[PDB]
Design a protein around this ligand. Structure first.
Ligand code: TGL
Ligand code: HEA
Ligand code: PEK
Ligand code: PGV
Ligand code: DMU
Ligand code: CUA
Ligand code: CU
Ligand code: MG
Ligand code: NA
Ligand code: ZN
Lengths: 98, 84, 79, 58, 259, 46, 105, 49, 144, 43, 514, 73, 227
């Protein structure tokens, strides 16, 4: 009626599929599968933008449902503000898979 | 329809095998029966060179150009009638 | 028996632009009728309306092909 | 049968710079060369045939 | 190093060999229909098969062996296979439309009736009904295969899949034997034309679907599939259900209603 | 890896503007001329 | 959405913020000139004084420029605006574009 | 510093235009093109039968 | 002041009437007197001279509104050049008429046309408005 | 858009050359076929 | 290295580059065919002395412009360069399949060339209607080579459609919904759904024609009970969605170019523009028998197809008015791309309007198969589409190459092309009203003057085309490298520089939810 | 030296649009008027007048006598 | 026939074609107002230095621009479909004539009483009589009674063709295996010309149609003499 013999992802998943699986398990998202949640985005509480280098593109949707997305390179250093709405973003660089 | 049986507790592998061997394959056995029983050569009809049938606007790209790909001499007449 | 024929009148069975079935149906009616008469030793003259209607409507080459196929025994409609 | 997928995962993740279609070894090369020879040869021959068919053969 | 989950594919020769194999098959059918020769066509068919084989072999290397199929990749491939089945359903729709067009308005050359004068249709309650039960049964067994795999059951997945494949082969041999026995041909007017072209492209799809399930059978034998990650098997099942539904429309339309 | 940058992401050379002129000439010129030589070809078969 | 008086006061306050920074100066001016109006002298007055607090004489002249620009073909508008800002201009020592010859092409 | 247009504009405009008018008037009137305009107000009808 | 390709990701200068306060100053490295000028700008602007004020504007901005909005003579090169290539086209058409086209049908001969026009009027071609409507059949001439 | 000065400027003379050679590459081969159409028609 | 890059590509941008090159070269073939057409008609009498060759030229002109110029440029060329850049995606979903869609095109084009070289070519019209396209009135390989050509172009565009739908649905940033993607990316997704659904039906119908010609089937042959008119329904069931496929990516490009050179952050009424493209794409499936108003169709069927065809004007007008509203209030930059786009707004509107005159089956009786239809579709299709392609090419050329065009030369090119196409096609309206049939190698004498002028306009557009080739050479010859580009904050495709690196978005963009 | 009166400073673009859209509607009425009279009614009157006293037998006799017909000399 | 420099339709010979002219005049006036409103607004949007670039609300203006077209379309569809149903209403013809297309000539059959048929070929240009029209004249014209409703039935004995007479408002495809019907009524005697309107091979341009419309008594004698 039953019996086994089929591998599981735990046993057999490899390469990037396994990396994504093992990160999900720890609740981390190094391959950017999820949407980040906004902070209040003030100068004291900037949105924090992980990157592996010293600049990353940010798209800001200034208000919920805006169809227009505002795009700009976010550089390592002091917080920058969206050119449309002023919300603050600060880059937090570096590293990944040990 | 529900069909006329019951189960729905869960449609797992055991349930689908139960259907495979208890409904699906038994149907196939029945219809194999019924077919191979209404089989046996029905007697062929008078050839009539109807112009809407046995079309030949170009020779076929095989054999002598005038035989269909799965030609059966018993039941497929040529435009000029059944083969000798 | 009610004549003065100019051409085939409008027929509400075939009210659209494609008139192929009108020509075909009157050809069939004529020959069915003429089978019935000729056989029943009756008289072909009652079949005349259909002859008039199909001669008006049917391309000559179609009447002529269907006539050859009747003689040949390969006409596909039932008469 | 036994599960040899781990062996295969190691072969294909070997850091030798080969592209996937050649990473299985010399046989991938032979099959690649037979396929590309037939496509290119058959393409030269279709052109020949168009050449032939482009002209009346009285 | 990327930090998205998508797959950058190695540069590959298979797109160009598949494009050239299309050129050789189509110019080869031209040579076969017009210049009395099969040479170009045999080369095209051979390159097409080599291309498919290396191409899908690489997809498996990328997934099973290299781990490039993350969930985002897999979701892509799901949409891809559904979009493809939709294009095939449309291709079929044009042949159904040809069938209905000819049969609902039979012309004078036919006798003005459907089935045309002089056509003797197959009895739909004979081999045609057998073929319907054989394909419907293969929809049940393949669903059993799918639940066995998801449940981790290697031997029953295998056995349910083998049974699915045997039923596909049986439909193919029954239909091949019907084609031979049929008293009408593809050259018997629009009756033969619609019957054989519609059922023939459906027949081709059964053969392609059974080859797809056979590839899954061999991949299962080598343990490629995990109980949770087995998209090639799901794609083959979707395509098989597609072929089963086209069959049901063909059976109701052409064999039953058009008899 | 592959060359990148202006003039390098294309399958033709823009290194010399006169050799590129010749190339663009042959390329566009051969597409434009082809239908003329096809008409001539058909008129010459009879 | 609001009365003219409320719109103007919103913008007056905006530019009057004492510690307004350079980014906020440029964001205000760049957003303001997107609207279908020439800014009231009172708005302009606040933005010029923001330029003062920010030690930026260049942007004060540019602001006067963009006023003239936003009036398009309505020639009467800019001199009316300058008329009205004259006490501020005198007080802060801001020269007009025309006084610096920056209106010639 | 004058650009191309400041230097050559007037010249390109005036000769392009003269040239264009000249060569079209010549093509249209001197080389035997048959425009086939209306006969109305211009052809005297003549017996044909 | 030199802009480089490697700077594409950084905020840059632009002169636009609709973006009057750009993201960066026109002049980024100041000379020593430009610097002291910046220093002076921290005191009353009434103590700056016209040239100092002009030169404070030019360090922040590249062109003034008057300048960046100026009209040009490009329209003359565009229109005269387009006329020129249109005129060149006519050389092509003159070539094609001379070397490609042979004689047109005999039906365009003047005497054929006069006869054809009479036959069109005898058949009353377009009698309501188009053609015969334009002939006076009483006075035997084109209507005035 | 702003751009750098040309790295390999194309002077008016060089432009007249590239323009003239471009035009001939479309005009001459087609000229030749069209000029000889009768030679083709009556073969 | 070269073979790996350019023959084995799996890169969206390079594949896009090859599609642009292929389409450009096709556009030269198509142009040469159109000039042959207008030479034949340029004076009364015969030029080619061979009307089977004239009809082969007419047929090839249309297959080359549509399948080998417009679709590859717009969907293969701009679609591939722009769509992944505009959603921050690292490539297409199926980057290796993407490259078969490209490579199937040269063999498809070679088949069409072969059909015209063998026998007497296929002089059928691009509709390829039986019985003229069947094995008695067109015996021999030419028509079947045309059918195979279209099979290969069909598989190309069907695999393309799957790849673009998947890419656009699956690969945007996790925060961006569909109502945050750029109008050009929606215009592609909707073109693709039309291609996915319409091509398989063209494929079924031409396969039935292939089997009629070669396997003694009789789908379209009345001797076996078939019907020529079944073929027209299958062809136009595809052929009407094809015309929307040919314009929809040009409407996406126009929305981008007008927004940009109007100095605006966004197109007026975004969701109205999404809705208008979806509405047009949907209606585009229920109108096809307006191609068949004289085949003998029932009066109620004509009334329905007239009314359904007209309705398309409503969502199309929302687009036109929304482009005007995007110009409205703008700081207008009179660049050469902007001029292409403004000439597109006006000339597409002219042509859509004569399409609405033809939608009236009563007037279409008299206009069908005359030059009024040829005039209609050269406005809305040949100019609409061509002006969108030229505006997109001049606009994005510096993104794709890293080099600027000479704008003066490009304004000159526009002026010349504008004069040419209007001198060419405007008189064709008079020819159609006055009864001149289309698909004719010669015409009654009364049609000479408008045909003469139309042929001279053709030569003007030829000059514009030679000039374009020179303009592109002069750009690559001079190598002026791009330094700065405005409005990148709302034109994501420009933000990685010109030309962007081989791999872009290896690190994806960061977009918050909130 | 007198003060400058305060002018309209807001909604100048909207004002300009309203004005010209209105003027465009006027011009549309004008053109329809002209066109009904110069094309549409002209046509109606041309056909009406032509047929009012038309005599088809007389028209035929004139054509017959000009020698145009195959069937009528 | 068309005449040199013609801009619009051939003058109407039938009450239907007259209707079409008036319906074309109404629709063209719409087409010109719309295309010139669009050109005007384009010039209007491009001719001011005043700017407004902030986000604009669309949901007010989109009403005008949906309702107003919807109304215009209805105002075209109303007269359009009136004509359409009017062409379609039961006609009672006095005569029926068949035409068969062939490559490349027409044949006509008048078989209501006698068996009359003949072929109608273009007059070659080298054989035209002085004053006759290049590409338009035929040897044997289709003679027909004037001021009488005639039923024309159209078919083909080879590829498609299409039988058209622009001044009578007529065009009906000619399809082998199919008999299409249309009706013809001329208000006037005269010669009315048309040309084949569905591509049918190398001589598509060279198979015209000429109607010769004359009083019934001429038609009757002409028929008798063609037997
Ligand atoms: C090329 C050769 C030109 C020949 C002209 C006619 C000769 C008159 C002799 C002869 C002396 C006149 C006496 C005869 C009366 C004719 C009776 C008739 O039955 O009449 C029926 C006629 C009426 O035709 C005419 O009344 C001709 C005028 C053309 C319409 C207006 C556009 C003006 C532009 C034309 C310039 C050329 C190309 C540019 C056009 C640009 C594309 C539209 O035939 C048509 O319906 C064709 C219209 C096609 C539909 C397109 C509609 C939208 C067009 C664009 C509007 C743009 C707005 C501003 C327009 C903006 C201007 C750029
Ligand atoms: C880009 C390609 C393209 C496009 C987009 C269209 C758009 C339309 N076309 Fe056309 N069409 C062709 C390409 C195109 N067409 C081709 C190639 C053929 C011929 C095929 C052949 O036989 O070979 C053809 C043929 C064709 C015919 C067949 C004519 C015949 O053969 O007799 C018809 C019939 O209705 C038709 C109608 C329309 C209509 C109503 C539109 C509408 O979609 C246009 C809607 C647009 C507007 C109306 C203008 C913008 C709107 C406003 C400014 C709002 C206000 C307007 C109103 C209220 C009216 N077209
Ligand atoms: C048993 C299950 C069926 C499998 C089919 C077996 C045969 C070979 C392979 C092709 C399969 C499918 C293609 C469908 C098209 C053609 C008809 C085929 C269906 C069939 O096989 O029909 C047979 C005729 O075959 C014939 O002509 C055969 C001619 C073979 C030529 C193949 C056709 C080539 C042209 C088709 C190209 C297809 C292009 C489609 C492109 C896809 C769109 C992108 C019927 O035999 P018969 O003797 O007439 O009648 C029986 C009387 N005893
Ligand atoms: C006698 C032969 C003559 C017949 C002619 C044609 C021949 C037959 C072709 C049969 C099709 C074989 C397809 C084999 C595909 C195998 C590769 C595969 O299935 O690839 C999978 C991805 O699926 C994927 O690409 C999905 C791949 C989609 C394949 C779609 C196949 C249909 C092709 C149809 C051709 C149709 C032409 C129709 C004519 C009109 C791999 O991912 P997983 O399975 O999740 O594995 C990963 C796990 O192991 C990790 O834990
Ligand atoms: C639709 C597109 C075409 C547009 C118009 C083309 C414009 C013409 C460009 C010139 O083309 C040439 O001109 C010739 C004459 O002017 C030819 O010489 C011919 O004429 C001679 C002199 O009459 C001889 O010297 C030569 O043999 C020769 O073949 C000829 O070969 C050709 O290349
Ligand atoms: Cu007969 Cu066209
Ligand atoms: Cu359409
Ligand atoms: Mg037609
Ligand atoms: Na000609
Ligand atoms: Zn923001």
């Amino acid at each position: 009626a039953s019996g086994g013999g089929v591998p599981t992802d735990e046993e057999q998943a490899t390469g990037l599929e396994r990396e994504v699986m093992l990160a999900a398990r720890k609740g981390q998202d190094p391959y950017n599968i999820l949407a980040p949640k906004a902070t209040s985005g003030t100068k004291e509480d900037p949105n924090l933008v992980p990157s592996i280098t010293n600049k990353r593109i940010v798209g800001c949707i200034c208000e919920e449902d805006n169809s227009t997305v505002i795009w700009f390179w976010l550089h390592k250093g002091e917080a920058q503000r969206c050119p449309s709405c002023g919300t603050h973003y600060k880059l937090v660089p570096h590293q990944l898979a040990h | 329809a529900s069909a006329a049986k019951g189960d729905h507790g869960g449609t797992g592998a055991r349930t689908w095998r139960f259907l495979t061997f208890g409904l699906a394959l038994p149907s196939v056995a029945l219809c194999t029966l019924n077919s191979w029983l209404h089989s046996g050569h029905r007697e062929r009809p008078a050839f009539i060179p109807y112009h809407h049938l046995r079309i030949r606007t170009k020779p076929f790209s095989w054999g002598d150009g005038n035989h269909t790909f799965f030609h059966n001499p018993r039941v497929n007449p040529l435009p000029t009638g059944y083969e000798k | 028996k009610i004549k003065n024929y100019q051409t085939a009148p409008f027929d509400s069975r075939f009210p659209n632009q494609n008139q192929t079935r009108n020509c075909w149906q009157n050809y069939l009616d004529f020959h069915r009728c003429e089978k019935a008469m000729t056989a029943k030793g009756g008289d072909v003259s009652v079949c005349e309306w259909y002859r008039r209607v199909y001669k008006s409507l049917c391309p000559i080459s179609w009447v002529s092909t269907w006539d050859d196929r009747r003689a040949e025994g390969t006409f596909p409609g039932k008469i | 049968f036994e599960n040899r997928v781990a062996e295969k995962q190691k072969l294909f993740q070997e850091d030798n710079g080969l592209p996937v279609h050649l990473k299985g070894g010399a046989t991938d090369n032979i099959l690649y060369r037979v396929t590309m020879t037939l496509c290119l040869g058959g393409t030269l021959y279709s052109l020949y045939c168009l050449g032939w068919a482009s002209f009346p053969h009285k | 190093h990327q930090t998205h989950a998508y797959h950058m594919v190695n540069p590959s020769p298979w797109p160009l060999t598949g494009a050239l194999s299309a050129l050789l098959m189509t110019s080869g059918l031209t040579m076969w229909f017009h210049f009395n020769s099969m040479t170009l066509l045999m080369i095209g068919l051979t390159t097409n098969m080599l291309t498919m084989y290396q191409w899908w072999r690489d997809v498996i290397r990328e997934s099973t062996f290299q781990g490039h199929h993350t969930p985002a990749v897999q979701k892509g491939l799901r949409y891809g296979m559904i979009l493809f089945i939709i294009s095939e359903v449309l291709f079929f729709t044009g042949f159904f439309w040809a069938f209905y067009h000819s049969s609902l308005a039979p012309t004078p050359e036919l006798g003005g009736c459907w089935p045309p004068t002089g056509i003797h249709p197959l009895n739909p309650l004979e081999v045609p009904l057998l073929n319907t039960s054989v394909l419907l049964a293969s929809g049940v067994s393949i669903t059993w295969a799918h639940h066995s795999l998801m449940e981790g059951d290697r031997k029953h997945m295998l056995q349910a899949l083998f049974i699915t494949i045997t039923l596909g082969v049986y439909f193919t041999l029954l239909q091949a034997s019907e084609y031979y026995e049929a008293p009408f041909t593809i050259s018997d007017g629009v009756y033969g034309s619609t019957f054989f072209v519609a059922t023939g492209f459906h027949g081709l799809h059964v053969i392609i679907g059974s080859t797809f399930l056979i590839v899954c059978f061999f991949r299962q034998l080598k343990f490629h599939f995990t109980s949770n990650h087995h998209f090639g098997f799901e794609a083959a099942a979707w395509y098989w259900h597609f072929v089963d539904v086209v069959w049901l429309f063909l059976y109701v339309s052409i064999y039953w209603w058009g008899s | 890896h592959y060359e990148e940058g202006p003039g390098k992401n294309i399958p033709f050379s823009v290194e010399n503007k006169w050799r590129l002129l010749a190339m663009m000439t042959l390329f566009f010129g051969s597409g434009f001329a082809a239908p003329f030589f096809i008409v001539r070809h058909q008129l010459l078969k009879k | 959405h609001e009365t003219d008086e409320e719109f103007d006061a919103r913008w007056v306050t905006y530019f009057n913020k004492p510690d307004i920074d350079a980014w906020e100066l440029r964001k205000g001016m760049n957003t303001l000139v997107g609207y279908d109006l020439v800014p009231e002298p009172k708005i302009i007055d606040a933005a010029l004084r923001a330029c003062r607090r920010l030690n930026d004489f260049a942007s004060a002249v540019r602001i006067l420029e963009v006023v003239k620009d936003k009036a398009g073909p309505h020639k009467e508008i800019y001199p009316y605006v300058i008329q009205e800002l004259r006490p501020t201009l005198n007080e802060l020592g801001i020269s007009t574009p025309e006084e610096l010859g920056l209106d010639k092409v | 510093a004058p650009d191309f247009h400041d230097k050559y504009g007037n010249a390109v405009l005036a000769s392009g235009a003269t040239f264009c008018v000249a060569v079209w008037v010549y093509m249209a009137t001197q080389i035997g093109i048959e425009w086939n305009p209306s006969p109305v107000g211009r052809v005297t009808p003549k017996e044909w039968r | 002041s030199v802009v480089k390709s490697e700077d594409y990701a950084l905020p840059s200068y632009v002169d636009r009437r609709d973006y009057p306060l750009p993201d960066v100053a026109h002049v980024k490295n100041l000379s020593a007197s430009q610097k002291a000028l910046k220093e002076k700008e921290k005191a009353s602007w009434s103590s700056l001279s016209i040239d100092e004020k002009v030169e404070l504007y030019r360090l922040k901005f590249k062109e003034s509104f008057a300048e960046m909005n100026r009209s040009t003579n490009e329209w003359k090169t565009v229109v005269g050049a387009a006329m020129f290539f249109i005129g060149f086209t006519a050389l092509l058409l003159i070539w094609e008429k001379h070397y490609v086209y042979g004689p047109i049908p005999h039906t365009f001969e003047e005497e054929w046309v006069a006869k054809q026009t009479k036959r069109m009027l005898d058949m009353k071609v377009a009698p309501i408005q188009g053609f015969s409507a334009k002939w006076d059949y009483d006075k035997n001439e084109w209507k005035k | 858009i702003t751009a750098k000065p040309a790295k390999t400027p194309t002077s008016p003379k060089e432009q007249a050359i590239g323009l003239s050679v471009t035009f001939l590459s479309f005009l001459l081969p087609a000229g030749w076929v069209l000029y000889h159409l009768d030679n083709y028609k009556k073969s | 290295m070269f073979i790996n890059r350019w023959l084995f590509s799996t890169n969206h941008k390079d594949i896009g580059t090859l599609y642009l090159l292929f389409g450009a070269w096709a556009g030269m073939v198509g142009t040469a065919l159109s000039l042959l057409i207008r030479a034949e008609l340029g004076q009364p009498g015969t030029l080619l002395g061979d009307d089977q060759i004239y009809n082969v030229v007419v047929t090839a002109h249309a297959f080359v412009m549509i399948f080998f110029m417009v679709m590859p440029i717009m969907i293969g060329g701009f679609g591939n360069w722009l769509v992944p850049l505009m959603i921050g995606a690292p490539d297409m979903a199926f980057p290796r399949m993407n490259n078969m869609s490209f490579w199937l095109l040269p063999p498809s084009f070679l088949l069409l060339l072969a059909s015209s070289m063998v026998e007497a070519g296929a002089g059928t019209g691009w509709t390829v209607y039986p019985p003229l396209a069947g094995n008695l009135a067109h015996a021999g390989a030419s028509v079947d080579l045309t059918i195979f050509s279209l099979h290969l172009a069909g598989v190309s565009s069907i695999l393309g459609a799957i790849n673009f739908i998947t890419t656009i649905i699956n690969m945007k940033p996790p925060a961006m919904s569909q109502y945050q993607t750029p109008l050009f990316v929606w215009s592609v997704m909707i073109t693709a759904v039309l291609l996915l659904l319409s091509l398989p039906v063209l494929a079924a119908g031409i396969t039935m024609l292939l089997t009629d010609r070669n396997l003694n089937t009789t789908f379209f042959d009345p001797a076996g009970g078939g019907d020529p008119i079944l073929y027209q329904h299958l062809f136009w069931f595809f052929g009407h969605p094809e015309v929307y496929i040919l314009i929809l990516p040009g409407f996406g490009m126009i929305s981008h170019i007008v927004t940009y050179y109007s100095g605006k952050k966004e197109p007026f009424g975004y969701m109205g523009m999404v809705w208008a493209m979806m509405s047009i794409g949907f209606l585009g499936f229920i109108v096809w028998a307006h191609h068949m108003f004289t085949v003998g169709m029932d009066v109620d069927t004509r009334a329905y197809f007239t009314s359904a065809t007209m309705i398309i004007a409503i969502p199309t007008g929302v687009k036109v008015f929304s482009w005007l509203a995007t110009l409205h209030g703008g700081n207008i930059k009179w660049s050469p791309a902007m001029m292409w786009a403004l000439g597109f707004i006006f000339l597409f509107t002219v042509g859509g309007l004569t399409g609405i005159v033809l939608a009236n089956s009563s007037l279409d009786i008299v206009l069908h198969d005359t030059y009024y239809v040829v005039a209609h579709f050269h406005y809305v299709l040949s100019m609409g589409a061509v002006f969108a392609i030229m505006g997109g090419f001049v606009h994005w050329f510096p993104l794709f190459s890293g080099y600027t065009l000479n704008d003066t030369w490009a304004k000159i090119h526009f002026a010349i092309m504008f004069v040419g196409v209007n001198m060419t096609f405007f008189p064709q309206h008079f020819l159609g009203l006055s009864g001149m049939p289309r698909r004719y190698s010669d015409y009654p004498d009364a049609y000479t003057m408008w045909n003469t002028i139309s042929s001279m306009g053709s030569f003007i557009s030829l000059t514009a085309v030679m000039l374009m080739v020179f303009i592109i050479w002069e750009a690559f010859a001079s190598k002026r490298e791009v330094l700065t580009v405005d409005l990148t904050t709302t034109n994501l495709e420009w933000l990685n520089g010109c030309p962007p690196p081989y791999h872009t978005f290896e690190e994806p963009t960061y977009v918050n939810l909130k | 030296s007198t003060a400058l009166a305060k002018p309209q400073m807001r909604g100048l673009l909207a004002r300009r649009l309203r004005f010209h859209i209105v003027g465009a509607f006027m011009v549309s009425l004008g053109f329809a008027t002209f066109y009904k009279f110069a094309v549409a009614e002209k046509r109606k009157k041309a056909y009406a007048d032509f047929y009012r006293n038309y005599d088809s037998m007389k028209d035929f006799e004139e054509m017959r006598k000009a020698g145009i017909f195959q069937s009528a000399k | 026939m068309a005449y040199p420099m013609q801009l619009g339709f051939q003058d109407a010979t039938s009450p239907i074609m007259e209707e079409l002219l008036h319906f074309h005049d109404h629709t063209l006036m719409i087409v010109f107002l719309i295309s010139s409103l669009v050109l005007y607004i384009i010039s209007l949007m491009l001719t001011t230095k005043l700017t407004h670039t902030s986000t604009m609300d669309a949901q007010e203006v989109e009403t005008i621009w949906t309702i107003l077209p919807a109304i215009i379309l209805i105002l075209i569809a109303l007269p359009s479909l009136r004509i359409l149903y009017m062409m379609d209403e039961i006609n009672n013809p006095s005569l029926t004539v068949k035409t068969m297309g062939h490559q490349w000539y027409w044949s006509y059959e008048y078989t209501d009483y006698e068996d009359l048929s003949f072929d109608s070929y273009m007059i070659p240009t080298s054989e035209l009589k002085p004053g006759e029209l290049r590409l338009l004249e035929v040897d044997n014209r289709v003679v027909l009674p004037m001021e009488m409703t005639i039923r024309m039935l159209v078919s083909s004995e080879d590829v498609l063709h299409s039988w058209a007479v622009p001044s009578l408002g007529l065009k009906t495809d000619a399809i082998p295996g199919r008999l299409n019907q249309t009706t013809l009524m001329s208000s006037r005697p005269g010669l009315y010309y048309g040309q084949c309107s569905e591509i049918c091979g190398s001589n598509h341009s060279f198979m015209p149609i000429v109607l010769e419309l004359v009083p019934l008594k001429y038609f009757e004698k002409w028929s008798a003499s063609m037997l």
